[PDB]
Design a protein around this ligand. Structure first.
Ligand SMILES: CCC1=C(C)/C(=C/C2=NC(=C\c3[nH]c(/C=C4\NC(=O)[C@H](C)[C@H]4CC)c(C)c3CCC(=O)O)/C(CCC(=O)O)=C2C)NC1=O
Lengths: 172, 162, 162, 172, 162, 172, 172, 162, 162, 172, 162, 172
């Protein structure tokens, strides 16, 4: 896996160069907003189970054929596994945010997922909707002005949105 | 790839748990340090040529045989002198990378791992490179935190060579 | 026992390597945070009784059945009211411990691990404790860093309970 | 293993108490001298192989029967292993300092070592000597005033001496 | 999928041996019991609605807060009252399945495995369902073997929930 | 694996239904003939090594190219292996009967067998002939009226034949 | 492990003898009361979590020092484990009853337990009291005349008591 | 030690579960069988001498070379004729044990396991013993279940020998 | 495939090392032996028919029953007498292979491995073949090294049958 | 694996024949030139690291893009791995010689190598060049007349060349 | 401890089989070689001082800096000159051992294993020792087999150094 | 393990000496009698199963309580194991001889055997007798003058006897 720094250091090394005054600057900036990023991570994390559960509930209401007997989330075995996935996807998206790089998510989580689902008979488009619901609630939770130093978090939010978006994209 | 951020994420994932405050305290530590770290990298980058030249010479001075012994592992010709700079270059570059990444990671992965064999195979002396590094230390002229940290990576390469 | 310091030492030892600058940046993180952390633990300690009472009551209000159903998992009698405060107290105490240690460790090791079976066996509700915690959150009255961190442990216990 | 903090929580928990205002202050101060401790670790670590090699060399000059054929450090196999222990005892001592608690050292390194040596036929008193020499050199390396902000490190030095001392004591 | 027949086959295959008289005695035991077991299934199946209704009510009486507390894990609305019956329905269906298969297998696979997380996550009480099951026990009105066996599955579910 | 009961429970659960009066009766009848099925099992099992060995021998006599040097059953290694297969196919066929469901056999034995043979260079059609001979001999052994309460076993016979038939079919 | 039959076979074989007309008779009678034994098992089993939980609660009420902070059942980790033992001892006791021989209990559960406890610092005398409480409650539950064909279970009761008794004995 | 009771107990223990109705059906199977089985043991025990002698003879008739070939694996002398009865006696005894235990267990543990090496080493013929068992089959004169079951163990020994 | 050459290569590869002087010593041992060994194979190959015929007869003499007992494992008919020569042929063939290869390899892989089951399943006697081999020994009429080596494989087959 | 003898033995066994007087003679001759073969093995082996290292260096000189940053042999990790391959291919080639049969090389080394490299992104043609360079230097080293009984090694040389050649071919 | 004899015994024991003719061929190889090997060891032992001195000088000639650079890894003083002979002595002794054992075993166990670290730690050059060995090769003056074997071990040490 | 050479090479190294003219001669002599030793190995090996089986049979005739029901060799399981040991001890003894050093035997076979037997309840003295019987028969088989070049094998015999003797010794 790369982190935001390490990603750049990897690209530099295959060129044989030292990072450019330009690109140290870009990173130096990313360092200044460190604090926001961490709040993002703490806020999503400190709400993991509300984020997941609420999202799963809203998915099943929306799509009852999933929990109807014979649908892919019928049976405790499966219900649990489906919750478990939601949570994982969320866990991995937080890592991505913490590290400022999509790799910890692409590599250890999204990659090959599409074919796992396809082979099991899990409907991906459904997982996506679930992931999408988590995205929304996560975002709301980070952007809430209550209890924190006021500032612009809009860039961060756009980034976080990205990570969710590719999790979803990776299962359609 | 040993960096505060990846190490942190990596334990967490190995214990299948969400990032707790612990890992946040790690990211804090890293982000706080990065200020010193990145100015450090810049400085080294701009003194790049003086540093390399300077270091190469230093080794040639401590080990004069290396400039007149015949044959390929030594630097009596131009071809050799060029390899030697090249390598000292590598060390320096890795050191910059370390400062940027906040750990030994990139030096570990790009240079330290497998160094043993290369040196043994091509008959290159660890002692030569140790001197190169010693010089860089006494000549980067860095101040305070930048210095303490850069030196930590230079001493690390030195340790990896004894 | 998840703390910045023990975690750092722990990976290192698992990789058979000396402590690098990385682990140093971890310690930094931890030591910088400790200021807010230790102040936080002390506030919580002095508001101990108000907080526990307060909380117990909050739960009894959200879940009034708990003060009138017969039988041992409930708090209709004195004996039960007593257990309930006891427990809430445990939660709070752990939270202070976390602030002091700078991680979830002490709550993980003393209270979270096995909680599931205790609650299942004695027929206690996760939801009751969730409320207790929610209360302590809204009533410790802490400033800035101390708050951000305390709440992180409080929300952690809550997450462990869903 | 315990760290300086965690050691205190462990004892508090068996008494069922929150840490007293007194003990929070003690830790608060240990926190304020954080920086020095970390220098101690970076300085010893940053010199590990000088510390070991020099010490080992001194030891062997001092006790040549160790490397004479038939003595416990004859043969590359064993010389290597002997070096390797020196470095390990050192490694663990630095861990102790970093964490501010002798446990990393007592548990994963010193414990049962005496009997490993006895059973192998390694002379402990010699290992001790080796360890004692590293202590001296380590200490000198931390206390050196060059290139650092001036201050009193005398408490730290006394602590660091402690850890070496028990490594040595644990093998005689 | 724990049934006398598949268990028997399964150990045999795990020891790479043909079916001995032992596994024949297993089948015997199974086939003998099935008479009682199947009649029992029918009975439960025909009393299905009375039983579910009845049980759902019993729960609402033991735990009156479940019909007035707001929010989705409770049954203050129709939506919720419907989920609850649904679930009790499930328990009862699994029971019939067990009687038919001559083991806890189907309840194990379909319902018990992962129940823990489902109840923790959606904040549902084991105690609620325990009551439902207790009711079904005292109201199936089965006689003799059919009873001692059905009740064995019912109590099994109960144990799985403590 | 499913047994005759469990097979039905499975289908019923994907429909969300309880088993219908009709289907409980159908199972109840299979329960009444319990005793015959078991005799089926004990009879074939109690004669395994005649059933196999005789079949193997009549196969080799019928197809000598198999045991001519260079043929797939030349060399002790392979002769033993080929015997071992016969016996396996038989063992799995007995399990099927015991359980009243083809799954043990399909899953743990027949599935992928065709491609193991093809890749090894074992002639399937030959295996099938072997299996077919065991079928004939197994059947005769179960239908023999000596030493058993008289009855109609004709339904059972037909079922047993089926299992053998799909083993054979699974390798042509 | 031995079962009641197997135990007797085990002794007969070391003597080189077939079981005597006497001892077949003793087994034959144990066979005739089969049904009661199995009720014993189903009754205790189908009440396992009441039996354990109730017992555990009385124990802690009786012995608060066990759950006071610092005592061996303090902390969820340990409380859970302590419950888990209770339940284990009980499970093993049920096995003994089912099989009609103390061996499954002696071998896989009681053996070496005294020294596990001693090493851990668990007070055996306390486990004993817990075990004893379960004995009393299990016995009650089997002897209850409600819902069962009346008869004499007094011999069976005596045996069951035996098993509990040696479990308790095995930890004092 | 493969018996209905110990098998049942064994799986259960290996899945860390209490005994379910499944294992109770196993015990039922066993205890119902035990009637036929134990009378079967008695019959076999009281025809013990006629059966052994008889069997011995049968072998000597199928394989007359066994009574005249010189050397220790054969039965030309009294010593050898004695060994042979001894062994056939062993098979018979094991068969009784099986009927009592309700499974192949005791023959497996005492006789079948390692038989291969014993016979190879001492050059004894499996075929000889197969004949002995064939005879015991055709001469125990048992009826109905006692017979079906005894013969099952006899045939099992025969299969273990091919 | 146990031969001096492959064995040597095989250890080397298993310790990831180049062939040392040790394995060269192995090859030497092998190549010196090969002179005796190869002559020995020629000799056996030319005395092939006399040897098999002879052996077959020897067995039929030691064990006359084998020529008169009915049924397929014996040699009362032509069909059987033919199988028996075939097999003894196989033995001899393997022995030649062993001499050529310089080890038991080819006999181990083509004949010895699984022999046990073949003989058990088809009711063939190890003793018969031992006799066949014992005859081949006394009748190849080889001398010095050739003989010692050939006999070593013949005895080996014998030991594999006891 | 097969050795020169064993190779022939196996072909003979699949035909059910003993080795023909012709074929024993052919083997008999290969035996007479034993000594030469061993010299080749000892000569190549005694020079392994010169053979490899000299080869490697002149591959890198010839193809600098390999060791320019971003090429497959830049980074010590990779350089070492590349060297390690060179050595292995050579090791396996010596084994072939020693055993007089290509199999050990084909099976344990060349087989699937092409696709390992393809998947890693190692340039095969490059490895081949490296292998070819070792082939030339190996051959020189065996053919050198210094310090050995004079004779014709031409046949053996042609054989050794063949091994190298197929190693090279196996990665293009 | 790689020797033809122990290797042979070692495979055998690892395949749980008695020593076959293969291993006897190994022994043969070893004992036939031993002639040359033992002469060779004696020769080397009596040329011991000439050979050590000589080689030491050779290294000092190829690498003159080693006799003038300050500090303990080098041989400017008597102390260091001493250590150097000592070590070369070691190499030669090992070589004699190899010859007597018939394999690299004793050099492997007593010298090669861990040499990497020793050299890295004390900053000794493999290249120095390589020269020492090169000299012993060109100066033992041994004939034919004794030469081709001794040189094998010498070259083996060299290879272990690159 | 040591072989006769390596044993010497081992003692020399701990002294830092090269093998003395005396000791090379001693080894050189052992080399000249190489052929006899190999004969001794081939002869014992070429008869292992007579040697074992005959010895086992005498032992049992001699000590019938061993195979009477209840004794340590009754039951096929155990009989087989007992034969296996006999064979093992024999196999190890042959290794000793081949190598001319007791070590293979002492380390991998005799060491700790006494306590395995004690713990199992196997009578060592009995195993000793068995080993003793194999010694005699082995010795007879090596000393037989038929079919070999005449010479004196008395010293070798004395050595072989030694190895047996210590196997026996090691279990009394
Ligand atoms: C691997 C197959 C193989 C074997 C088995 C083998 C044995 C063998 N035994 C030999 C010698 C001998 N073997 C013996 C044997 C004995 N002297 C006695 O007193 C005892 C009766 C007997 C026990 C050793 C003697 C005395 C010699 C002559 C001395 C010698 O050549 O070392 C020799 C050298 C000369 C010869 O007799 O032919 C060989 C090659 N060679 C082989 O290639």
């Amino acid at each position: 896996m790369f982190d935001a720094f390490t990603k750049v250091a990897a690209q530099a090394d295959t060129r044989g160069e030292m990072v450019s005054v330009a690109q140290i600057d870009a990173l130096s900036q990313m360092v200044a907003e460190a604090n926001k990023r961490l709040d993002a991570v703490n806020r999503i994390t400190a709400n993991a189970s509300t984020v997941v559960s609420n999202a799963a509930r809203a998915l099943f209401a929306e799509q009852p054929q999933l929990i109807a007997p014979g649908g892919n989330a019928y049976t405790s075995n499966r219900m649990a596994a489906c919750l478990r996935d939601m949570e994982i996807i969320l866990r991995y998206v937080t890592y991505a945010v913490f590290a400022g790089d999509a790799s910890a998510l692409e590599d250890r989580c999204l990659n090959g997922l599409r074919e796992t689902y396809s082979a099991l008979g899990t409907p991906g488009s459904s997982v996506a909707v679930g992931v999408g619901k988590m995205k929304e609630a996560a975002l709301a939770i980070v952007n809430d002005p209550a209890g924190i130093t006021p500032g612009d978090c809009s860039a961060l939010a756009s980034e976080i949105a990205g990570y969710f978006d590719r999790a979803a994209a990776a299962v359609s | 790839m040993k960096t505060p951020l990846t190490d942190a994420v990596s334990t967490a994932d190995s214990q299948g748990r969400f990032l707790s405050s612990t890992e946040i305290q790690v990211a804090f530590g890293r982000f706080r340090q990065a200020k010193a770290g990145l100015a450090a990298a810049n400085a080294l980058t701009s003194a790049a040529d003086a540093l390399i030249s300077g270091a190469a010479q230093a080794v040639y001075n401590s080990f004069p045989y290396t400039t007149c012994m015949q044959g390929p592992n030594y630097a009596a010709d131009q071809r050799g002198k060029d390899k030697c700079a090249r390598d000292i270059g590598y060390y320096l570059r890795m050191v910059t990378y370390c400062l940027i990444a906040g750990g030994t990671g990139p030096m570990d992965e790009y240079l330290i791992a497998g160094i043993d064999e290369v040196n043994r195979t091509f008959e290159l002396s660890p002692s030569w490179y140790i001197e190169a590094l010693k010089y860089i230390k006494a000549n980067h002229g860095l101040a305070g935190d930048a210095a303490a940290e850069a030196n930590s990576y230079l001493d690390y390469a030195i340790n990896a060579l004894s």
